Amino acid sequence: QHMWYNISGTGNNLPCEKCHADVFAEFKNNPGAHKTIGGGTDTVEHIRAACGECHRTSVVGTFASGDGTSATPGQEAHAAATIACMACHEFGPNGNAPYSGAPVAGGFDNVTTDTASSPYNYDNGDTTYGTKEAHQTFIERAVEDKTLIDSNEACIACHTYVPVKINWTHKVSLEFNCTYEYNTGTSGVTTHYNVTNWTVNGTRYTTVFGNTTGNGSVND
Amino acid sequence: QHMWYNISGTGNNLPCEKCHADVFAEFKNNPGAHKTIGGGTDTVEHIRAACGECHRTSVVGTFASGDGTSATPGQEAHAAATIACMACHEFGPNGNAPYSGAPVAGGFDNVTTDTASSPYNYDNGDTTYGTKEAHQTFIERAVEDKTLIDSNEACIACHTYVPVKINWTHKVSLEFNCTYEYNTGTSGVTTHYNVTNWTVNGTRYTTVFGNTTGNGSVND
Amino acid sequence: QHMWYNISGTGNNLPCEKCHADVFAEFKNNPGAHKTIGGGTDTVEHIRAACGECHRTSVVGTFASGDGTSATPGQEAHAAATIACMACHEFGPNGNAPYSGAPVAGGFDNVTTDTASSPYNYDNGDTTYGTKEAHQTFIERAVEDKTLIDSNEACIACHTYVPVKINWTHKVSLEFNCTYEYNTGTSGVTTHYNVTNWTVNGTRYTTVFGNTTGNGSVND
Amino acid sequence: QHMWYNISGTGNNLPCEKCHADVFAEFKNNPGAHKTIGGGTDTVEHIRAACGECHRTSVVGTFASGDGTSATPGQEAHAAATIACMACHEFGPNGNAPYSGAPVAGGFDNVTTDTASSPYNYDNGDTTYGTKEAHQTFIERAVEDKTLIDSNEACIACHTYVPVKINWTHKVSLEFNCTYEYNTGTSGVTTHYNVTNWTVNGTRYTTVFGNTTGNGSVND
Amino acid sequence: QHMWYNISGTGNNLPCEKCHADVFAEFKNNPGAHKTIGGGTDTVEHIRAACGECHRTSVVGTFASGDGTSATPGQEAHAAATIACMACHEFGPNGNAPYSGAPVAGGFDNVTTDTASSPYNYDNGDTTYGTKEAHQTFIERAVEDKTLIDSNEACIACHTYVPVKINWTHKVSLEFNCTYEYNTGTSGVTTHYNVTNWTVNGTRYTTVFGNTTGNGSVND
């Protein structure tokens, strides 16, 4: 309680690992896109730099930093701040990208619901163009419900090692009938028909559990 | 939430099956035309490649893809997009086919109704030639009513394992009468007659349910 | 919606019965000429082959067909086309018959009305010979009025299980008078007479209903 | 017991080390920010001046001091007073800093709990601005529980050579289901869905011990 | 035994040194605050006057004194009385100081234990003000245990040339755990946590010896 660390270095200086070893163990064995976000995986310092570059990046304003000789006061967060999966992957070369080299991600219409919305510009400029994302509403519902910060509830589902159990629904039957064009009777059949209506009958449920490695096992 | 997947591979990389196992189970037991659309059925990777090739094909523009080293931003859809049954089966050797090897399908007059229509060129060039499809209007009514995307409501009915219940109609009786050519009376009958009019009488209904295997059972 | 049928077989492959069971039930109990047009009646596959051979025959051009390995694009009709009762029964050994074994049917003068006509060659070559068909005009009036395709409105009337109600007409009386050959008077009668004119008087109607089995009941 | 020390010097005069040698040994080997808070580390007098400047600074009022010729009576503490880690690092150039050169530290919302609070002004003026500190509540809980004076229980945890053992918690599984938009059945799937609810299942524990040098070893 | 001393002088007259030479030798080499309490150090008479002024001051009542011509009977002590370190340093200008020029010392809350207490008024009037003395209880425990008169056991420890050996104690480890706010699972981590409890583990000892000159040597 009298020999506090030296923070004279650049970037993150104190060890984030004094209380966060489990996340370190998880991240050291990551084959994902960001193995080299910190410039390496073999050394502990590279992983610490990666954590600094992700959880202390240029999000809103300068974080808290210093080098013994001087210290820059923290503006909106001292140690670290949780950031959305997308705040880095929002704009690339078209606008002012957060990281030079970061690829602008996806392409969806801007999530503007009746209750909540997101400040990030989804359309990336091609507002009339990018609209045919089938999943789409998966992101919208995640944005609507505040479970993870901003839009991570759905974005983390299918890129990460996160097991998920979901309840699928699909009705047993959907069917339809058929009418004639003003003529029918003792003729076997009219020359032409017409079809209208599409009715429904009987309901089915489905549940599936997915493991960490992505294998899909259904408990049908 | 710190060990996201590797997408360095070509084509679809992450497992689509983390949330879609039931469709995998359905498709693995498919004896239909597209058992080998993904190059195989025995391995899971082949089925994943098939799903990529169908739901992420060249429809409008490049989908979202990457390999860790670089990433191509998605243009109109990030993960996958629902596509009509016909968007692949629309043109073959005559025009620019979507798949080299895909057979141009069917042959109908272009669906141009009073309200809606389809951009796909049905006639395949032989506009004056292909017209005598009896079913025809079945496709037109499916196009008119937006239940499935574009023209799948009817196209999926008779090629797939989709049970259907329809209400058939045919009137009980259609009949007609007979006139003479200016001569008749106490002669038994004139040398020649003429027949006109075709009238109707009494109505009949019919309903039929079809199972998955195509067996036709009618509840007459 | 992911396990569509296999069409690798020859001829019709998918089951036509997924939506047409009532016609199957009607045709299975047919004692008519075409019980064995499909090579059998006991098996469902034989009936399906019969439907293919009738509604998908060589009429104008190749229909749509395939076997998984390859697919032949449909030329003028994809699934099936309505065909006239006669298009098969038009020419036999004299010309190019549609079916080897099909018997050329009937024999009438070519229907060439003032408004419409038929491309099928009725006379079968013996143009000066086949002319004394009493019914004849029954076919002509059916051709004139587009109720069934081409010339089926009359052709289906007396060969099929189709109940018909018609209004017969015949005048009550047709009679005539008588003149002498320049001589008459107080002689009782002349040696010879002459007869001219044939007049008419009073009108009668008649209506008859015929059941499926051909029994003739008249509501006189 | 008759030759008491001379305190004629400025600042701290008597040796604090007559009973506090272990803390001296600990502080002499400090590579942290405050090696030169006393103007040196090599001489004992510099370390004594550092202890005076830290534990006898201008906190509330003048401490006890004298020079033989005169003595200033102690106001609220004679020898030394324990001071919070932050009482020096609370305000810099904006307000009246305690040390000219001391950097204002961190940036958090003012800790105003339902039970206790702190008089130090955390927001530093930018009340609406500094709010996105992820750790935040770590400081609040330390303030709530009186284990160290004011807000040192958490502030000393990650800057100092203080080994810590904590029990991490994270539940085994969190998952969710899925509903259709009024349409489903024998259609394979509806054009669009909706997703609601996020459920939980099974619990996991985690414990980690951290050494003096900051190495993170987890006993998973 | 017939030529007893002359005490006609003022103050102390007989030589205190006839039996107390060692204390004289100790005090002659004193660089502390009271070199000139007797008005000098060079002459023996000045040191004798200092001893008189300290051990024969106005404490409770007049001591024993005389000048041959007259003698004042001793009231509570004839030769000298042991006095507490503080009885002179208790009140200055606020109350009735013992010496005009004596500085009121320190500032602590009044020592009022469950068993013993002191009549001297510690708070000096600022009862609500002077409370933040960290050492504080060091004086209280000295007052509780009668080893030196009143409150000298601790007061003599850190101002005088008195070597001390003390046994320090501090436990090896004190640590804590962490809980979530109603949400956790397959989400990597919840948006926010909570921390409770502070546990202990393993014990450490420490002993230190301090010499006359104040150098701190620890036998760790």
Ligand code: HEC
């Ligand atoms: C008492 C509550 C605290 C005070 C006073 C300060 N901190 Fe911290 N701190 C933390 C990190 C991760 C850094 C990196 C900064 C760098 O690399 O220079 C810092 C830095 C500082 C600094 C210098 C930089 C600046 O002034 O902005 C000061 C003066 C400072 N800290 C004061 C992390 C943490 C932390 C982890 C949860 C806690 C509890 C504290 N800091 C507490 C205090």
Ligand code: HEC
């Ligand atoms: C937060 C909402 C998300 C961000 C940011 C990104 N995604 Fe995805 N994603 C998905 C698939 C099926 C792929 C295949 C691409 C490939 O094979 O390379 C991807 C890929 C990416 C990429 C790299 C490729 C590119 O930039 O176009 C990035 C940068 C990316 N994704 C960012 C699928 C999904 C998905 C399933 C429903 C979700 C929720 C997300 N992606 C979310 C995000």
Ligand code: HEC
């Ligand atoms: C979406 C509107 C459709 C597409 C695309 C295709 N069909 Fe069909 N189909 C039907 C039958 C009775 C057959 C028999 C052909 C055979 O036995 O091989 C077929 C066949 C095909 C084929 C392969 C043969 C070919 O290309 O000509 C393709 C590529 C094909 N179909 C594409 C019947 C029906 C049907 C019943 C009313 C409908 C709605 C569709 N087909 C729809 C589509």
Ligand code: HEC
């Ligand atoms: C008997 C209980 C005590 C009396 C009477 C005094 N002290 Fe102390 N003391 C201590 C320190 C660290 C200082 C520094 C002051 C300086 O540098 O001038 C002092 C100083 C004094 C002074 C002069 C200054 C003043 O009057 O404020 C006086 C008159 C004085 N002290 C009287 C520390 C300690 C200590 C360490 C735990 C103890 C037990 C005492 N002092 C006890 C007494």
Ligand code: HEC
């Ligand atoms: C022990 C003193 C820690 C050190 C060293 C670091 N962190 Fe931490 N962190 C700690 C706790 C007890 C918690 C949970 C408490 C809470 O109120 O949530 C956290 C949490 C985080 C988070 C997420 C915050 C949240 O989800 O609520 C992040 C992003 C985080 N910590 C980052 C982080 C970094 C980058 C560190 C190195 C500078 C670091 N932490 C060190 C305790 C401790």
Ligand code: HEC
């Ligand atoms: C007044 C007696 C202080 C107390 C109590 C604490 N700090 Fe300090 N700090 C003070 C000054 C005047 C300065 C700037 C001059 C200097 O020599 O640094 C600082 C600076 C720091 C820094 C900056 C270096 C860096 O962050 O890398 C840090 C980290 C720092 N102080 C930490 C710190 C901690 C953890 C404290 C409580 C145990 C603490 N300081 C108390 C003055 C004072």
Ligand code: HEC
């Ligand atoms: C869980 C994180 C999923 C993963 C992994 C994949 N998909 Fe998905 N998909 C998911 C949901 C919850 C839904 C329905 C939600 C909705 O708004 O509709 C879907 C739906 C589809 C669809 C059809 C869209 C529709 O009919 O509305 C398609 C074509 C689809 N998904 C494709 C697809 C592919 C190719 C995947 C591998 C890259 C894949 N999905 C993964 C959830 C999840």
Ligand code: HEC
């Ligand atoms: C800023 C700190 C980022 C955050 C937050 C996320 N990503 Fe990232 N990403 C970033 C950069 C600078 C790059 C390009 C450089 C590189 O080393 O890749 C990327 C790249 C990706 C990729 C590309 C590889 C691939 O797609 O196969 C993917 C898939 C990716 N990022 C995913 C991803 C996810 C799921 C994130 C939220 C958990 C995420 N990134 C956050 C910068 C940043």
Ligand code: HEC
């Ligand atoms: C349900 C998906 C069907 C399947 C399987 C088959 N047919 Fe069909 N047919 C269907 C409907 C809804 C209609 C009437 C709609 C209309 O627009 O007329 C028909 C009609 C026919 C006809 C006559 C057309 C007419 O008179 O207008 C024929 C000759 C016909 N169908 C043939 C046929 C064959 C051979 C099939 C097996 C390949 C077959 N149909 C399957 C619906 C469905």
Ligand code: HEC
């Ligand atoms: C592009 C992703 C396609 C989609 C969408 C559909 N089909 Fe397909 N089809 C495609 C190719 C490249 C081929 C030829 C190569 C092969 O392996 O077959 C086909 C072929 C068929 C066939 C031929 C076999 C047969 O008819 O017996 C059929 C019947 C067929 N396809 C049917 C079909 C249906 C019903 C579709 C919508 C659900 C459909 N295809 C979509 C490429 C693509």
Ligand code: HEC
């Ligand atoms: C081609 C698909 C045909 C259609 C359309 C019709 N007929 Fe047919 N018919 C065809 C063949 C190849 C044969 C000879 C082989 C055989 O199994 O009969 C026939 C035969 C007849 C007969 C002969 C038996 C008899 O007259 O007693 C009759 C009566 C007959 N066909 C009637 C008929 C009718 C009424 C049709 C329209 C509803 C019709 N045929 C169509 C081939 C084809």
Ligand code: HEC
């Ligand atoms: C022996 C006579 C000591 C001298 C010389 C100094 N200190 Fe001390 N200190 C001593 C003891 C026996 C204790 C613990 C007793 C208690 O009641 O706590 C302390 C404690 C402190 C503390 C912390 C108080 C606490 O945490 O309770 C501080 C800040 C402190 N001491 C400072 C200090 C300084 C600056 C000194 C030089 C003037 C000094 N001490 C000398 C015993 C002795």
Ligand code: HEC
């Ligand atoms: C009355 C006989 C006293 C006794 C008993 C003690 N002190 Fe004293 N002290 C007294 C006076 C009149 C003065 C001021 C005049 C002077 O010459 O100093 C003092 C002063 C001090 C000082 C001030 C110098 C400094 O603190 O640096 C100190 C430190 C001091 N006194 C200490 C001290 C101690 C430790 C005593 C008990 C052993 C003690 N004094 C007793 C009068 C009297």
Ligand code: HEC
């Ligand atoms: C020999 C005849 C002495 C003369 C001359 C002085 N003192 Fe003394 N003193 C003497 C003895 C044998 C003792 C200890 C005996 C005992 O019962 O304690 C003392 C003790 C003191 C003390 C402290 C008393 C104690 O701690 O118990 C004091 C304060 C003291 N003496 C003062 C003192 C003064 C001021 C003298 C000059 C007038 C003086 N003493 C002379 C023996 C002798």
